[PDB]
């Protein structure tokens, strides 16, 4: 049982899609982070907001 999967792009908008990965977050350290595509550099702290 083998299936030939097709990944096709046509004259249709790419409205519909998917993604994932995960490392234990550090704290109180100057590090560069990538949160769900939001990338930056700084120090992460617990907050009450």
């Amino acid at each position: 049982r083998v299936v030939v999967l097709s990944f096709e792009l046509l004259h249709a908008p790419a409205t519909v899609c998917g993604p994932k990965k995960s490392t234990n977050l550090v704290k109180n350290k100057c590090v560069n982070f990538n949160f769900n595509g939001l990338t930056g550099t700084g120090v992460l702290t617990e907050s009450n907001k």
Partner: protein, 33 residues
């Protein structure tokens, strides 16, 4: 009765249907406003 006051509409759902909508209507529930 739209009263006087202020209220915000928190987003409920967004969907990537990706079709063209030009008209609209509504439907009702009756078993034989």
């Amino acid at each position: 009765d739209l009263p006087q006051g202020f209220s915000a509409l928190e987003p409920l759902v967004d969907l990537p249907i990706g079709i063209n909508i030009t008209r609209f209507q509504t439907l009702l529930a009756l078993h034989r406003a």
